[PDB]
């Protein structure tokens, strides 16, 4: 599940773009 949006979430920590995907999340570079 998502709490802020993978984007964000992943875009905090060091990532282009993300979201969530069925195993949970995934960010992409």
């Known amino acids: 599940a998502c ?3 993978c984007r964000k979430y ?3 920590k060091g990532a282009r ?3 969530c995907i ?3 999340c ?3 570079y």
């Open 3 to 5: 709490v802020e949006n």
């Open 10 to 12: 992943c875009q905090d």
């Open 17 to 19: 773009n993300g979201k």
């Open 22 to 24: 069925n195993s949970n």
């Open 26 to 28: 995934h960010c992409y």
